[PDB]
Amino acid sequence: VDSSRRKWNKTGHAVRAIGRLSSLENVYIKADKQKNGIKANFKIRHNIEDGGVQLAYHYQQNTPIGDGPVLLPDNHYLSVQSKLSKDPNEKRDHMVLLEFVTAAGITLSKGEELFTGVVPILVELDGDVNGHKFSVSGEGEGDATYGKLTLKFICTTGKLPVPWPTLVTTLVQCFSRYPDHMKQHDFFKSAMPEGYIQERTIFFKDDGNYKTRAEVKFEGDTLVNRIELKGIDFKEDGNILGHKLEYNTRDQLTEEQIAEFKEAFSLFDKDGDGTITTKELGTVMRSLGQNPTEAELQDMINEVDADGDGTIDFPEFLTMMARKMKDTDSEEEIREAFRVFDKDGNGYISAAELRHVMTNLGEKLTDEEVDEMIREADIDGDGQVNYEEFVQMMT
Amino acid sequence: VDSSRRKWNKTGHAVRAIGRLSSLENVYIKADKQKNGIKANFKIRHNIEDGGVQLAYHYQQNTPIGDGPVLLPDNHYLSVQSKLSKDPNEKRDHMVLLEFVTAAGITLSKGEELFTGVVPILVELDGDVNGHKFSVSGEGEGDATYGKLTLKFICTTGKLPVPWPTLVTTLVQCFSRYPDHMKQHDFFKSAMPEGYIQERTIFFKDDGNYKTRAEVKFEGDTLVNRIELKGIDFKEDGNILGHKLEYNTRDQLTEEQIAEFKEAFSLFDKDGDGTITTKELGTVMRSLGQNPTEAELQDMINEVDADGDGTIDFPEFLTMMARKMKDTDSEEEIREAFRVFDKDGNGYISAAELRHVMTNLGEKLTDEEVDEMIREADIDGDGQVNYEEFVQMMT
Ligand SMILES: [Ca+2]
Ligand SMILES: [Ca+2]
Ligand SMILES: [Ca+2]
Ligand SMILES: [Ca+2]
Ligand SMILES: [Ca+2]
Ligand SMILES: [Ca+2]
Ligand SMILES: [Ca+2]
Ligand SMILES: [Ca+2]
């Protein structure tokens, strides 16, 4: 490569480095004290079909509905993982949405109490974009312990006149997971049950804007998000009215695979508080016969610890487990997993070894259920699981 | 999938999660006050040819050679990236080694002054493993500003009787990069120029052990590491004497590609202190026409900030740039990079736009050199770079 190409590479690397650094779409929150609430600013990148991105610049204000005291936070952010899919049995225009949201950015009430378990959610939106009126209704549930939202939305007026992904931020941030050390900065939950008003302007670069106002509050045991949206100045053949935005990707974990990981997570998180501490991680590792030091345990957690709280929460765990792996590395991971099961290292996992491994993990199973696991894997019928049989179960 | 397979998946995920969490091989350091030095503990995982891992449990003590005062640290660790390769022109049994080492684990002198620039290194080792005597000599240089070591080792007695990778930890931790907030915890540099004694026991699981003693000190301007190694109890057909350990991998960045990234890094790190601050990152981004907020800049850096010092150092930058990317994501990254160069967005990068982009990055080039870059990319000879021509330069 000549000196010219060397200069392209060098300068290309620098420009691509900025791209990678700034690929974040986090929700930046600050206090708006004179309105007794908060403001937020963030940038959504909507993938355009067949390449490119449509920027959506979000400006947000929240103010409490009630008169009682709320918590006004220091600067921090929310980080969001979204998965959009379709219900194969649904003929109406619709969106199935799975979302994990966590707070971070700050280093180590009666409202919070309303979010300790699973909470039913209702969403109603009436919209008007360039004169095109439409409504959406949504239902599902939130589980703030895991920063989790699962909802299904239906366009109740027929065909949605804008792309589903453009409505996602508009369609309940009280379901975000705030770590313990940030509980004093959780405005959203502190305003409950009376609720808050959420207002946004969303500017679509080189296109129109949405203006939204929403009431977010409890009606009985249900968290309700009632929204009005007004969109103006949109181009008839732009990305929005022209439906040129990508709905989702195939490279996303199934909602079912995510559930499997949540199950696995629970084996570590034995008190169900939504975290794995060094204590909990060490307990499982010691049960399996390993002996990590306290420094190692702290280090292992720190490595995947996005919010810096010193523990692994479920979205952090999911991020680690969704990490895409080289086939050679995948093979080594499975090979090493086999050794954990195969306690005496003779190359066969016996029914007894499997029973003990289940017990070590805190997986409660009858001996019969363990024999059924053996049966599932046992190709040659010797009543035990060899390496190749185990490989099939990890594949 | 039946309930049995569901249980395999769940339990498999948990065991594989432990594997991923504990894949770290960091060097855990603590003070050894009664010896006026330090101790370290860590575990090296040597890949075995065709699968599996050979564990090497390391125990380490360091004590100062001189009588003057040294710095005794709080608990922390070193994180190491190693690349082993071969010199195609070298017929002697040899190892070319490239290493980046950084300190971390603690949250936000005349010895340190000896390491601000590039320092020549000499390494001499006399070894005796199971009666097999051998020597190794090494030479190269260390650049602690980047946590960088580059050395070439030769077996001066003929054929090395053990695998090269087993000698790596034995063959100068004063070259590790300690962030500013941890400078008081850098024992290694503080003992210079007089040096320190480094002793280890290295236990190879199911095999023999090495016992090493080394003198690490300045002789004139050269940092010298003089070592004696004794290995006993090794199995003639084990991984070590039987040479069954993997030397390296093909999935590693070239030493030349790494140099390209170091060049790109310098465009951000304009004061050459080995970090990129928010100030420096923002300065480059603003020059290119972008306007990240202070919260965004802090967030972008925090995302890749392994040592928590609030800045990007070179090994952190390399980790981000060595991140392996989906072809669809790679394509989008290049597409977005094109837009940065193509200032007016007309789909052609003109000579003027390229000149400005170079200036914006702080890349000093004559206009002639910029025309030569154009010429390199310019397939259709219109004197400008279109998207497809630019793609070729990023590929
Ligand atoms: Ca827990
Ligand atoms: Ca955490
Ligand atoms: Ca066994
Ligand atoms: Ca079998
Ligand atoms: Ca700098
Ligand atoms: Ca850093
Ligand atoms: Ca142009
Ligand atoms: Ca051209």
DSSP lists the bridge partners of residue B137 as B124, B154
The shares of helix, strand and coil residues in chain B, as percent rounded to the nearest 5, are: 35, 30, 35
CA atoms of A146 and A143, how far apart (whole Å): 6
| Strand-pair category, A37-47 with A148-155 | unpaired
- Return the structure tokens found at B114: 């000896």
DSSP lists the bridge partners of residue B2 as none
- Nearest neighbour of B326 by CB, restricted to A251, A261, A302: A251
In the block, residue with structure tokens 């949206």: A229
B132 and B18 co-located in one domain? yes
Q: What is the DSSP string of B293-346?
A: -HHHHHHHHHHH-TT-SSSEEHHHHHHHHH----HHHHHHHHHHHHHHH-TT-S
B297 and B238 co-located in one domain? no
Radius of gyration of chain B (CA): 24
Give A-chain residues touching B264 at CB under 8 angstroms: 10-11, 13-14, 17
CB B295, CB B278: distance < 8 Å = no
- The answer to whether the CB atoms of A17 and B304 lie below 8 A apart is no
Domains contained in chain B, number: 2
Q: Which residue in A1, A5, A6, A7 has the most chain B C-beta atoms within 10 A of its own C-beta, making it the best mutation to test that interface?
A: A7
| Strand-pair category, B209-219 with B94-104 | unpaired
Contacts of residue B203, defined as CB under 8 A and 6 or more positions apart, other chains included, come to: B56, B57, B59, B209
- Nearest neighbour of A4 by CB, restricted to B336, B341, B373: B373
B389 and B295 co-located in one domain? yes
- The answer to whether the CB atoms of A4 and B372 lie below 8 A apart is yes
- The answer to whether the CB atoms of A51 and B304 lie below 8 A apart is no
Query: What count of CB pairs under 8 Å joins A to B?
Result: 223
Give A-chain residues touching B13 at CB under 8 angstroms: 260-261, 263-264, 321
CB B79, CB B29: distance < 8 Å = no
| Strand-pair category, B222-232 with B119-129 | parallel
Is the backbone peptide bond immediately before A193 cis, with ω within 30 degrees of 0?
yes
CA atoms of B382 and A360, how far apart (whole Å): 69
Instruction: Report the binding-site residues of B for Ca(2+).
Output: 269, 271, 273, 275, 277, 280, 305, 307, 309, 311, 316, 342, 344, 346, 348, 353, 378, 380, 382, 384, 389
Which residue, A230, A253, A276, sits at the end of a domain? A253
User: Which ligand is located closest to the Cα atom of residue B357?
Assistant: 7
A168 and A228 co-located in one domain? yes
Instruction: Report the binding-site residues of A for Ca(2+).
Output: 269, 271, 273, 275, 277, 280, 305, 307, 309, 311, 316, 342, 344, 346, 348, 353, 378, 380, 382, 384, 389
Q: What letter represents residue A196's amino acid?
A: Y
Which residue, B186, B218, B253, sits at the end of a domain? B253
Ligand 7 centroid distance, CA of B63 (Å): 61
Q: Compute φ and ψ for A252, nearest 5 degrees.
A: -110, 140
Residue of B nearest to A266 (CA): B14
First to last CA, chain A: 42
In the block, residue with structure tokens 């923002």: B282
B219 and B275 co-located in one domain? no
For chain A, the residues before each gap (C–N > 2.5 Å) are: 108, 171
B190 and B301 co-located in one domain? no
- Nearest neighbour of A295 by CB, restricted to B18, B28, B321: B28
- The answer to whether the CB atoms of B21 and A264 lie below 8 A apart is no
CA atoms of B384 and B144, how far apart (whole Å): 42
Angle at A220 (CA atoms; ends A219, A225), nearest 5 degrees: 25
- The answer to whether the CB atoms of A333 and B19 lie below 8 A apart is yes
The Cα of A271 is separated from the nearest Cα of chain B by a number of Å equal to 16
CA atoms of B56 and B39, how far apart (whole Å): 17
The Cα of B263 is separated from the nearest Cα of chain A by a number of Å equal to 6
A232 and A276 co-located in one domain? no
Other beta carbons less than 10 A from residue A246's beta carbon = 17
Radius of gyration of chain A (CA): 24
B274 and B343 co-located in one domain? yes
In the block, residue with structure tokens 């199950």: A263
CA atoms of A268 and A282, how far apart (whole Å): 9
CA atoms of A76 and A28, how far apart (whole Å): 6
Residue of B nearest to A389 (CA): B8
CB A383, CB A373: distance < 8 Å = no
* CATH number (domain holding residue B221): 2.40.155.10
- Return the structure tokens found at A373: 């696991």
CB B70, CB B187: distance < 8 Å = yes
The Cα of B112 is separated from the nearest Cα of chain A by a number of Å equal to 27
Listed residues: CB within 5 A of ion ligand 2: A 305, 307, 309, 311
Ligand 2 centroid distance, CA of B283 (Å): 31
CA atoms of A261 and A266, how far apart (whole Å): 9
CA atoms of B148 and B144, how far apart (whole Å): 6
Rounded to 10 deg, the angle between the A255-268 and B3-21 helix axes is 60
B182 and B208 co-located in one domain? yes
A209 and A293 co-located in one domain? no
User: Which ligand is located closest to the Cα atom of residue B339?
Assistant: 7
Is A223 in a helix, a strand, or coil? Answer: strand
CB A120, CB A141: distance < 8 Å = yes
Contacts of residue A46, defined as CB under 8 A and 6 or more positions apart, other chains included, come to: A53, A54, A55, A56, A163, A165, A166, A239, A245, A246
DSSP lists the bridge partners of residue A225 as A123, A216
Q: What letter represents residue B344's amino acid?
A: D
- Nearest neighbour of A8 by CB, restricted to B77, B321, B373: B373
- Taken in order A251, A58, A80, A62, the sign of the CA dihedral is negative
Is A342 in a helix, a strand, or coil? Answer: coil
HSE-up (13 A, CA, CB side) for residue A161: 19
DSSP lists the bridge partners of residue A77 as A28, A104
Residue of B nearest to A2 (CA): B376
Contacts of residue A18, defined as CB under 8 A and 6 or more positions apart, other chains included, come to: B284, B285, B288, B290, B340
CA atoms of A85 and A150, how far apart (whole Å): 11
CB A101, CB A107: distance < 8 Å = no
Alpha carbon dihedral B390, B393, B394, B395, in 10-degree steps, equals: 120
DSSP lists the bridge partners of residue A132 as A129
CB B264, CB A13: distance < 8 Å = yes
Q: What letter represents residue B390's amino acid?
A: F
- The answer to whether the CB atoms of A336 and B304 lie below 8 A apart is no
A7 and A141 co-located in one domain? yes
Q: Which residue in B1, B15, B246, B291 has the most chain A C-beta atoms within 10 A of its own C-beta, making it the best mutation to test that interface?
A: B15
Q: Which of B34, B262, B294 is nearest to B146 (CA)?
A: B262
User: Which ligand is located closest to the Cα atom of residue A347?
Assistant: 3
Ligand 2 centroid distance, CA of A105 (Å): 11
Task: Kindly give the residue spans of alpha helices, DSSP state H, lying in chain A.
Answer: 3-21, 110-113, 187-190, 255-268, 278-287, 294-304, 314-322, 327-341, 351-361, 367-377, 387-394
| Strand-pair category, B312-313 with B209-219 | unpaired
Task: Enter the DSSP assignment of B213.
Answer: E
Q: How far is CA A174 from the centre of its chain?
A: 14
Which residue, B253, B272, B307, sits at the end of a domain? B253
Q: What is the DSSP string of B41-83?
A: EEEEEEEBTTS-EEEEEEEEEEEESSSS--PPPPSEEEEEEEE
CB B37, CB B45: distance < 8 Å = no
Residue B240: domain span:
1-253
- The answer to whether the CB atoms of A15 and B361 lie below 8 A apart is yes
Q: Which of A313, A286, A372 is nearest to B7 (CA)?
A: A372
Task: Enter the DSSP assignment of B110.
Answer: H
CA atoms of B36 and B63, how far apart (whole Å): 6
Q: Which of A166, A197, A190 is nearest to A176 (CA)?
A: A190
Q: Which residue in A3, A6, A20, A364 has the most chain B C-beta atoms within 10 A of its own C-beta, making it the best mutation to test that interface?
A: A20
CA atoms of A213 and B122, how far apart (whole Å): 69
Give B-chain residues touching A295 at CB under 8 angstroms: 28, 30, 75, 77, 105
Is A75 in a helix, a strand, or coil? Answer: coil
Contacts of residue B32, defined as CB under 8 A and 6 or more positions apart, other chains included, come to: B38, B39, B61, B62, B63
B272 and B314 co-located in one domain? yes
Residue of B nearest to A331 (CA): B51
Give B-chain residues touching A19 at CB under 8 angstroms: 333, 336-337
Is A148 in a helix, a strand, or coil? Answer: strand
Q: What letter represents residue B213's amino acid?
A: R
Ligand 8 centroid distance, CA of B378 (Å): 4
CA atoms of A113 and A117, how far apart (whole Å): 9
Q: How far is CA A55 from the centre of its chain?
A: 21
Residue of B nearest to A299 (CA): B105
Task: Enter the DSSP assignment of A175.
Answer: G
CA atoms of A73 and A188, how far apart (whole Å): 10
